[PDB]
Every structure is written in C-alpha cells, then in structure tokens.
C-alpha cells in the first residue's frame, strides 16, 4: 500500500499558493481493501468565496505572462508528472480502486494533456480580416476568459483534472478545482507538482469537500461572479443544475455528462478484433467510464459467433481482484450503491428474459466486488456504470442505427465493419461525439472529446480545446 | 406610406412552407404616425410545438443537401433581398420608426449577411490529426446541430434575423423564428423572399406573437426537445430566463444582450473625428441599439473643446421628424414606456447635477418623440436606450478604463486617440467584445459580433460565426 | 494516569477487520479529574450501513467454522 | 466610493492596495459632507466654521467613545 513520497500525497486543500486545512475533514478509503486513507480537508463555501478570490487575483497577473512563459511552466509541470508516474500512479489505484496498470494508463494520459496544452499556449492566433471601407482595418484578438470553476468525476482523478486545467491555463486563466471526494488526492498531488513546477500562486487551486458541501460549494463557485467560466464532467442531473446557477450569471460553460455507449458489431466485422475492442471498452476501469461501451448491438449473422467468442475471452483474462495486486484485470466498484446499480440491472434482465452467459452475482469477495457479466436476448426494454455488457441482436444497419441513435445520448459509440462504404455511412449518421472505428479505445490528448445533444457542451483537448477558455475581441481599427 | 408589393408584406405567420393565420391577432403600428398597420397572426404555443415540428422534419432532409446547394439557395435569397431593397426598406422604417436611410442601411447589412454565409456554407472543414499509434487514423467532421430557436429584438427587424439564420442554414440547420411584435413584418417579408428563393419548406419559419404569448412561446421553442439550439439577442433579463429553459435540456446557445457602451475620447484624439463617430454612434436609429455608445468619457484637456464642438454638430444636422420624411435624422422612440426611460434618466441627472447642453424635454411632436440631449458634469452615480449622450470628465487613462471597465457589460466600446501606443493598451485592456478605433460605426458582416462577461454567449457572423451551428464528431479510424 | 500499551487503547472505530476513523470525532474525559482522553471516532449512519455489511458478510462464512 | 461618488476629492490612495486580499492603501478625502456616516485605514476631513458647529456635529449623539 503506502511507501509513496509524503509530498505527492496531501490532505489540506491547496488554495492561493499555500496548503490550507478545512474546518472539518472527511475520510477517503481504498474502495478495495476498505483501509482508511487519512482525513482530507472538507472545504466549506466560506473557503470557496476565498478560493475564488486568490484565484481571481492570480489571474489579474497571470493574464500577463508571455505565452512562451506559461508554455514553459506547463512543460515544467508535465515533466514533474512524468518524473513521478509510479507514485502518481499508486495514488490513483489506491483511491480509484482500478488496476495499477490502468493507473499509469491514466497518469500518462494526464501528463500528456499538460504537455500538449503547453504547446498550444504559444499558438492562440488573432486574425486580420479584409473589409470594404478603405479607411478602416479589422482585427481580432482572442483573450483569456478569466477565472474558471472545475469539477471533476471520480473515475479519472487525474486525467479529468489535467485535460481541463491544462487548456484553461494555456489560454492564461485561473482555476478553482473541486474534485470528487472519492478520489481527491490525485487533485492535490497535482497541486504539489504544480507548485514545484513553479505555477504562480492561485493559478491552480484544489478544494476537497464531501457530499455534505458538494451542493453548497457547487453554486459557491458556479455563482461567485469572479468565476467567468465553468468546466464540468459528470452526471446529467448535477450538470443541468449548475447551468441553472451559471444562467443566473451568464457564465461560459462546457460539460461532458454521462451517456450510454453503443458498440455495433456488423457481419463484415472481424470477430477477434470486435471481441478485442469489446473487452477493452466495457471492462477498462471495470466498465466505470462515461465512454464505457454500454450496450453491444450485434448482427444475427455474427451474433452467436460473437458472444461465444466474447465470453470465452472474458474467462481467459478477466482476473477480478485488488488494484495493486499482480495480474489483476477487474478491480472494485467505487462503493456499495454502485454494486447495487449493477445488481439491479442484472436481475431485471434475467427476470425479463436474458440468458446470462457469464457471472451474475456479487463476486466472492463481496463488498464492492462483482464478477463481470454477459447477457443476451436482452430486449431494449431494459435501459449503468458497471462491468456488465448486454448483447442485443439486430437485423438491418438502419435498425442498428435506429436503436443506437435512441436519442438524447451523444457521448461515444463504436462499431466494427470491414465494408469501406458501411464505415462512412454508419460513422456519420451516428448521432454522437466520438466514433471508434474497428477499435475499442479512442483516447487521445490531440483529439476533441465531448458529446452532442444532451451529453454535453464544448470539447476538451486538441487544437480545438483551448478555445473553451478564450473570448474573441473584434477591433475595428479606423481613422485611416 | 403604403404602395409596397402585397407579397413583401405579410400577416399570417409562415410555418412549414406555407402561410398560417393565428387563432387571434395583434396590431402593429408605425411608432411615428400611430397609423395602424394591419393585424398580425399572434402565434400561441400550440403552434410552436407544431412549428418546431415542421422545422425538425425539414431538417432531417436539409441536413442532406450539398453544401454547394444550400450556398446556392442562400445566394438566390441574398439576391431577392437586393432586388427588393427599396421595398424591404420601407417595411423597416414603417415598423421600426427609424429614418428611411437607416432602413436601407439595415436592409443591405441584412442581405449582405445571407450573402456571406452563402459562401461560408461551402467551407466547413473537417480535420485529419496525426496520432502516435500506427494502426489508427483520427478524423474530425463537423455537422449541423439540427433545429434552432431564434428570437430577435425590434430595433433591427431584418439584420438581426438574417445574421443568425444565414449561418444557421449555412451549416445545414432549420430555424423557427419569433420576431419582436414591434417589428414582425420584416421577419415575414424575408419568409416570402426565402420561399421565392426556393428554400425547402420548414427550413425557415416565422411565428409572430405579442407579449401575451411571448413568455409562453418562449419556453415553447426553448424547451421543445426538437430544438437542439437557441440563438437570441435582447435584454439581460429575458436571456437569463431562456438559459433556465435550455439548461433543463442542455441545448446549444448564443446570446447577445444589452450593455452600455463607453466612448472614451482622449487628448491626442482628433475632435472633429471624435465628434464624428460620437454622433453616428449615439444617434443612429435614434440611440436605440445595443451597440449604442452609452456614456461618453472625455479627458479634461479636450473635454470642453469636445462638448461645444459636439453639441454644435447636433443642432447642425439632427433633424427630428418622421422616418419616411425627407431630411430626417432622428425618428420616434418605439413606444411610450421608452420615452419615459429617457425622460427618467434626464431628470435624475439634471436634478443631481447635470448642466444640460441641448434639449431635455419631450420634443414638440410628443408621443414617442424626444429632442436629442447632451449633459455634462454627469457624475457616474447616474447609470438607457434613447437619443441621449451624457459626457463624463476624467483624468488618467487608467481611470478612463477603470470606469469604462465598470464590469458586467462587454458589448462594444469606442475610443479616439492619435497615440499609436495608447491605442493598443486601451483597446486590449478594454473588457468588451468589440472596440471601435478612431471610428464610431464598427458594423461588418465579416467580423465577430458578440459580447463578454454577462453581455452574451457566442458570436454571429464572420468565418467564426457559422460554428455556432456545428458539432464536432471525432472519428478514430482504427483497425489498420 | 497514562502509561498503558498503545495497542489496548484505540480511537478509530473498528469495522471489518481493520481500524477506520470517523468523519468527525467526539471527546472522552475521565469523569473524575476532567482530564481529556483523546478524540474518538464518531460513527455516523453511513458507517453503520457499512458496518452492518462487513458484519453480514463475515457471518456468511463464520456460520461455517467448526464450533470447536 | 459612496464618498467619491457623492463629492469627495480623494487626496491619497482609494483602491485596494496592490497586494490585494485584505490589504488596502490608506486614504484621505475632503469636501466629505456629513451625509456619508467604518473600521479601516481611512480618514475623511470635514470643513467647519464655528466651535459650536464643530461640537454640534461631533456631538451628533448616540456615540460616546
């Protein structure tokens, strides 16, 4: 378990440049062994109106540094993460529960976000438009929005914080961060690394707080008028509420909420590969991701040939156990109510027609452990973040889409199909934000992550992400 | 008055391709002579849930036409406007009240928006990002958001409808339009022109409705789940409310609300030019614009030399009268409550220290007519859409900004200054969305109009505007 | 007063086999001298629905061991 | 601000100090007419004529520290 560097670990929220303990604390436990992991500062509103300050003030000056300078700091940070992967990793596995590998997996995917944005910071380009009138010359500068509120989910305690903040600070903004108390350490560990990197005090803050204040602080930072922006990743409910708090102050916003994820396997689709992505998508982090390939849609032809081939691969390598435990594939789910979200679905399926193919009951380790599962004959009248993938048989491509596009969900969808033509049609008509072609993992710091229709606003990462933190200022230069 | 082509004029809301009369109507009158201008269809919610339909369905097919095709239609439309300027003009003067010239002024600035976007429609570019992994190729397409709700103010009954819808349809979207019942005809006149141009039924709709239903229909279209987008221009209050309706359905949004407008005149500033822009900015449409240079800030040095020079120019050419009346500079304000918004301010200024320099009482035509006015010694403790420009003396550039940047207003600000250096500093520190340099009119279809901090979301027009109607779809092409 | 073995003494509630500190604590004092005796973990309901679990699960197996 | 805004020729400082937070640059104002009456490093000057008046105002009752 322990053994990490006392520095990478933290418990006192980090505001304005220095650590600051909360009036009262809240406990964090390894969602696997149950072992307590010290008390974390539980930030109450009074702190936000104070964190949002030292965040603001830090801006009034950070907005000044040469883009080259901020690109320098970021890099210097991206480094400190890289030079700490193995410790920054444990921090995740320990609080997320997820296998150690997936931890490094996250840790890199995190640093790599600081890295990239570090580069983007030096390329915010204004324009020089030509206009009729001979006497006036038009100009367009892009400038930082100012303070930015950042709330992050628990499943990616580092990558979810890095991808937003990297850009945020790339465009010269200041950020106040309320991580998920499930995994708040990775948020503070960054903080430590950022300070060492030399980030000017108040540019990057963290304010841990448990449920009790998650609602309060919520509006606290999403209302405080010094916050001109809000970036959030989470459940549809919470999101819609923050809007309601941002509306009141016409703030800038970008959210990526939940959203099922259709994984359409066609006949021209190669099975071993289709069963490839299939596994890596609905079993990574133990199927606890927004981009968790929810319901698999398979074409009668290759249907049975799929499941058999699919389930067989599961047994072959899905080793349920501890995160830091060698040779481990699945890990804990978060917490009790979670194993119940799976449990539920699993029974309402069996009970309503679902020939279970593998597993089905809580694993024999209990607690927050569940044995992965596969069902079929799963008629759509049964639609959950858990290591559970249900198969649905279909006939036409039109129908396969027809169902997948069962509107009001536009996060990420995947499909396998050897027909060059069918690729384009499916992939374009797919009302989503990210399509994985003959691949099951589509993560990448250089691409635009986000959803469509109610699955979110704005994107994160890529040449396109840093815009979430700029405002355009047209400047009509006249008198010529 | 009358004499126009029966076609350019309309009264039955236009939905799905064909005219449709409202259960009950509401009257529209020339805010100048009072003369009634027929009853317009007063659309009630039941119609919206029906307009939002035929708007949706029109999309499911418009999303298909070749960008070249839609660029063709738009142009064909831009033409029909151009070939109708003189009639499309009267329609505005008659319902807006504003001088006939300013009408043509608008009418062109309108068509020119269709024109431009007609071009943009053929240039929506996807990207091809390079990524590590040899086996997968990343792609990024941009696609239409679908249906779009459009509400427009009264002061620009045509340009405000054209600039949004042009883009909207450029990116292949469908629009439902609720114009300001003050000036709803220009919205229908377009409609007529659009049909003639050949716009597929339901791509562009108009649904007049007076106050009585403005609240209802409001959410009607801003909630109806077929509306995936909302574009609005108006008062801060109304806006914040729509958000509250869009939040509930995480819709895409872009708003440009009110916002004072600082017009900073420095010493290096040429007076005749400073008094130039000064006039054209706070007296166009009779100072009834969002981008209406609200409070003039002048540097002691050139202060007195300004006002004298300023007021003198007013008397010289500000001919108050009827809109269609030859040699007319000012026109009516909208309506009674409006002349009261001016009246108010004017007295709370005189009464609290404001040496009136010209005019001050309702004009001797009464009704919705007011004689322009100029005051000074106007201490900031008195801060209104009316032909009234108050002068405020200042010392330092820092202060001039200090005041102008009196936060929570970021629409458009103007300043005159012959110092090359001072231009850059002022113009960049100016927390706004559009800065007019040594010029008082900064209108242009090719540039980005919109504000910052609470004065709005997103921009309209320019290579940057058509984005308000696209969603990015990353597509990780794998299996290679 | 003090001098006892650090082990025999405790302050973090004991659930499922291992110690677990409470979100917030409550003080315990010698009802005689008044001298404070450290803060004890103050278990809140959320813990019970969790203690009653690891208690249950422990049963499903303890019900098995030989009475001997 | 309610002073400057209502007639108060600032003589020194007036905005939060350039250290921000809970720091403020001391200040001095004048022409400060009594219609503006605070524990902070801020001293406003009020011009008067008679000793009677000087008391008259100072003794603006319900304050005797």
Short mmCIF file of C-alpha atoms in Angstrom, two decimals, chain B residues 59-271:
data_model
loop_
_atom_site.label_atom_id
_atom_site.label_comp_id
_atom_site.label_asym_id
_atom_site.label_seq_id
_atom_site.Cartn_x
_atom_site.Cartn_y
_atom_site.Cartn_z
CA UNK B 59 -34.01 19.35 -41.09
CA UNK B 60 -33.94 15.56 -41.40
CA UNK B 61 -33.71 16.31 -45.12
CA UNK B 62 -31.96 19.69 -45.36
CA UNK B 63 -29.04 18.12 -43.44
CA UNK B 64 -28.64 16.25 -46.73
CA UNK B 65 -28.33 18.85 -49.49
CA UNK B 66 -24.91 19.56 -50.91
CA UNK B 67 -23.27 22.49 -49.20
CA UNK B 68 -22.96 23.87 -52.69
CA UNK B 69 -26.75 23.55 -52.95
CA UNK B 70 -27.52 25.46 -49.76
CA UNK B 71 -24.92 28.07 -50.77
CA UNK B 72 -26.94 28.33 -53.99
CA UNK B 73 -30.25 28.88 -52.23
CA UNK B 74 -28.85 31.44 -49.83
CA UNK B 75 -27.36 33.46 -52.72
CA UNK B 76 -30.64 33.16 -54.62
CA UNK B 77 -32.10 34.69 -51.48
CA UNK B 78 -29.45 37.36 -50.89
CA UNK B 79 -30.41 38.39 -54.41
CA UNK B 80 -34.15 38.61 -53.78
CA UNK B 81 -33.37 40.93 -50.90
CA UNK B 82 -31.08 43.08 -53.05
CA UNK B 83 -33.66 43.19 -55.81
CA UNK B 84 -36.10 44.46 -53.15
CA UNK B 85 -34.09 46.89 -51.00
CA UNK B 86 -36.42 49.85 -51.56
CA UNK B 87 -39.50 47.91 -50.52
CA UNK B 88 -37.79 45.83 -47.85
CA UNK B 89 -36.60 49.21 -46.61
CA UNK B 90 -39.96 50.87 -46.16
CA UNK B 91 -41.06 47.78 -44.25
CA UNK B 92 -38.42 48.57 -41.64
CA UNK B 93 -38.86 52.38 -41.37
CA UNK B 94 -42.59 51.81 -41.09
CA UNK B 95 -42.37 49.35 -38.18
CA UNK B 96 -39.07 50.41 -36.58
CA UNK B 97 -39.78 54.09 -36.91
CA UNK B 98 -36.15 54.79 -37.90
CA UNK B 99 -35.29 57.13 -40.85
CA UNK B 100 -35.65 55.62 -44.30
CA UNK B 101 -31.92 55.75 -44.94
CA UNK B 102 -31.09 53.75 -41.81
CA UNK B 103 -33.64 51.30 -43.25
CA UNK B 104 -31.68 50.67 -46.42
CA UNK B 105 -28.72 50.77 -44.12
CA UNK B 106 -30.22 47.78 -42.34
CA UNK B 107 -31.61 46.03 -45.40
CA UNK B 108 -28.19 45.84 -47.04
CA UNK B 109 -26.42 44.91 -43.81
CA UNK B 110 -29.01 42.17 -43.79
CA UNK B 111 -28.82 40.72 -47.28
CA UNK B 112 -25.04 41.01 -47.02
CA UNK B 113 -25.29 38.51 -44.14
CA UNK B 114 -27.16 35.97 -46.22
CA UNK B 115 -24.64 36.66 -48.99
CA UNK B 116 -21.57 35.99 -46.88
CA UNK B 117 -22.93 32.92 -45.09
CA UNK B 118 -23.90 31.60 -48.51
CA UNK B 119 -20.18 31.46 -49.15
CA UNK B 120 -19.24 30.06 -45.75
CA UNK B 121 -21.62 27.13 -46.22
CA UNK B 122 -19.18 25.64 -48.73
CA UNK B 123 -16.20 25.86 -46.34
CA UNK B 124 -16.95 23.78 -43.23
CA UNK B 125 -13.71 21.86 -42.86
CA UNK B 126 -13.03 18.64 -41.05
CA UNK B 127 -9.54 17.80 -39.87
CA UNK B 128 -7.09 14.87 -40.11
CA UNK B 129 -4.98 14.70 -36.93
CA UNK B 130 -1.83 12.67 -36.60
CA UNK B 131 -1.63 10.38 -33.57
CA UNK B 132 1.00 8.05 -32.04
CA UNK B 133 -0.44 4.53 -32.62
CA UNK B 134 0.47 3.39 -36.12
CA UNK B 135 -2.76 1.42 -36.56
CA UNK B 136 -5.35 4.14 -36.09
CA UNK B 137 -6.16 7.27 -38.09
CA UNK B 138 -8.01 10.18 -36.49
CA UNK B 139 -10.70 12.20 -38.25
CA UNK B 140 -12.88 15.18 -37.35
CA UNK B 141 -16.07 16.11 -39.11
CA UNK B 142 -18.30 18.99 -38.21
CA UNK B 143 -22.06 18.54 -38.57
CA UNK B 144 -25.28 20.57 -38.17
CA UNK B 145 -26.80 20.79 -34.68
CA UNK B 146 -30.31 20.39 -36.03
CA UNK B 147 -33.20 22.65 -35.10
CA UNK B 148 -32.51 26.20 -33.86
CA UNK B 149 -34.79 28.60 -31.97
CA UNK B 150 -34.28 32.24 -32.98
CA UNK B 151 -35.63 35.26 -31.12
CA UNK B 152 -34.88 38.74 -32.39
CA UNK B 153 -35.13 42.29 -31.00
CA UNK B 154 -37.22 45.03 -32.56
CA UNK B 155 -34.58 47.65 -33.49
CA UNK B 156 -33.15 45.62 -36.38
CA UNK B 157 -36.21 43.68 -37.65
CA UNK B 158 -34.20 42.26 -40.54
CA UNK B 159 -30.46 42.27 -39.85
CA UNK B 160 -31.00 40.54 -36.50
CA UNK B 161 -32.93 37.77 -38.20
CA UNK B 162 -30.62 37.43 -41.15
CA UNK B 163 -27.26 37.22 -39.39
CA UNK B 164 -28.31 34.24 -37.26
CA UNK B 165 -30.40 32.30 -39.78
CA UNK B 166 -27.89 32.79 -42.59
CA UNK B 167 -25.28 30.88 -40.63
CA UNK B 168 -27.83 28.56 -39.09
CA UNK B 169 -28.83 27.32 -42.56
CA UNK B 170 -25.26 27.60 -43.80
CA UNK B 171 -24.32 24.70 -41.52
CA UNK B 172 -27.49 22.96 -42.63
CA UNK B 173 -29.89 23.65 -39.73
CA UNK B 174 -33.59 24.51 -39.53
CA UNK B 175 -34.87 27.63 -37.84
CA UNK B 176 -38.01 28.69 -36.02
CA UNK B 177 -38.21 32.49 -35.63
CA UNK B 178 -40.20 34.54 -33.06
CA UNK B 179 -39.63 38.18 -34.01
CA UNK B 180 -40.36 41.20 -31.86
CA UNK B 181 -44.05 42.04 -32.39
CA UNK B 182 -42.91 45.66 -32.64
CA UNK B 183 -41.37 44.80 -35.97
CA UNK B 184 -42.56 41.39 -37.15
CA UNK B 185 -43.18 42.23 -40.79
CA UNK B 186 -39.53 42.25 -41.86
CA UNK B 187 -39.41 38.72 -40.49
CA UNK B 188 -42.31 37.65 -42.71
CA UNK B 189 -41.12 39.66 -45.69
CA UNK B 190 -37.91 37.60 -45.52
CA UNK B 191 -40.06 34.48 -45.31
CA UNK B 192 -41.75 35.49 -48.56
CA UNK B 193 -38.40 36.14 -50.21
CA UNK B 194 -36.99 32.84 -48.91
CA UNK B 195 -39.86 30.86 -50.38
CA UNK B 196 -39.39 32.59 -53.73
CA UNK B 197 -35.67 31.90 -53.47
CA UNK B 198 -36.70 28.28 -53.14
CA UNK B 199 -35.85 27.45 -49.54
CA UNK B 200 -37.26 23.95 -48.82
CA UNK B 201 -40.40 24.20 -46.67
CA UNK B 202 -39.72 24.29 -42.94
CA UNK B 203 -36.09 25.34 -43.13
CA UNK B 204 -37.04 28.90 -42.21
CA UNK B 205 -40.16 29.69 -40.17
CA UNK B 206 -41.64 32.83 -38.55
CA UNK B 207 -44.23 32.83 -35.73
CA UNK B 208 -45.40 36.32 -34.71
CA UNK B 209 -46.80 36.68 -31.22
CA UNK B 210 -47.33 39.62 -28.90
CA UNK B 211 -46.41 39.96 -25.24
CA UNK B 212 -49.33 37.83 -24.09
CA UNK B 213 -47.61 34.73 -25.55
CA UNK B 214 -44.01 35.94 -25.69
CA UNK B 215 -43.46 34.27 -22.31
CA UNK B 216 -45.28 31.05 -23.22
CA UNK B 217 -43.91 30.51 -26.71
CA UNK B 218 -40.64 31.48 -25.07
CA UNK B 219 -40.09 28.15 -23.38
CA UNK B 220 -42.31 26.56 -26.02
CA UNK B 221 -39.45 26.68 -28.51
CA UNK B 222 -36.63 26.86 -25.94
CA UNK B 223 -37.77 23.61 -24.41
CA UNK B 224 -39.25 21.57 -27.19
CA UNK B 225 -36.58 18.80 -27.45
CA UNK B 226 -36.55 19.02 -31.25
CA UNK B 227 -34.80 22.32 -30.75
CA UNK B 228 -31.16 21.44 -30.24
CA UNK B 229 -30.12 25.10 -30.41
CA UNK B 230 -31.13 28.63 -29.37
CA UNK B 231 -29.90 31.98 -30.72
CA UNK B 232 -31.12 35.16 -29.04
CA UNK B 233 -30.48 38.89 -28.99
CA UNK B 234 -32.09 41.07 -26.32
CA UNK B 235 -32.43 42.22 -22.70
CA UNK B 236 -30.35 40.66 -19.96
CA UNK B 237 -33.48 39.58 -18.09
CA UNK B 238 -35.18 37.64 -20.86
CA UNK B 239 -31.89 35.98 -21.75
CA UNK B 240 -31.07 34.65 -18.29
CA UNK B 241 -34.58 33.12 -18.30
CA UNK B 242 -34.22 31.26 -21.57
CA UNK B 243 -30.98 29.75 -20.26
CA UNK B 244 -33.06 28.45 -17.38
CA UNK B 245 -35.18 26.73 -20.05
CA UNK B 246 -32.23 25.50 -22.10
CA UNK B 247 -30.42 24.25 -19.02
CA UNK B 248 -33.29 21.80 -18.48
CA UNK B 249 -32.42 20.29 -21.87
CA UNK B 250 -28.70 21.12 -22.29
CA UNK B 251 -29.29 22.99 -25.54
CA UNK B 252 -26.65 24.85 -27.54
CA UNK B 253 -26.79 28.61 -27.04
CA UNK B 254 -25.60 32.02 -28.13
CA UNK B 255 -26.97 35.34 -26.85
CA UNK B 256 -26.07 38.98 -27.21
CA UNK B 257 -27.79 41.08 -24.60
CA UNK B 258 -27.88 44.74 -23.70
CA UNK B 259 -24.82 46.51 -22.41
CA UNK B 260 -23.86 50.13 -22.07
CA UNK B 261 -21.14 51.35 -24.43
CA UNK B 262 -18.20 53.54 -23.32
CA UNK B 263 -16.96 56.09 -25.85
CA UNK B 264 -13.59 57.26 -24.50
CA UNK B 265 -12.20 60.44 -26.08
CA UNK B 266 -8.58 61.17 -25.18
CA UNK B 267 -6.49 64.32 -25.76
CA UNK B 268 -4.41 63.07 -28.70
CA UNK B 269 -7.85 62.40 -30.11
CA UNK B 270 -8.88 64.48 -33.10
CA UNK B 271 -12.10 66.31 -32.17
#
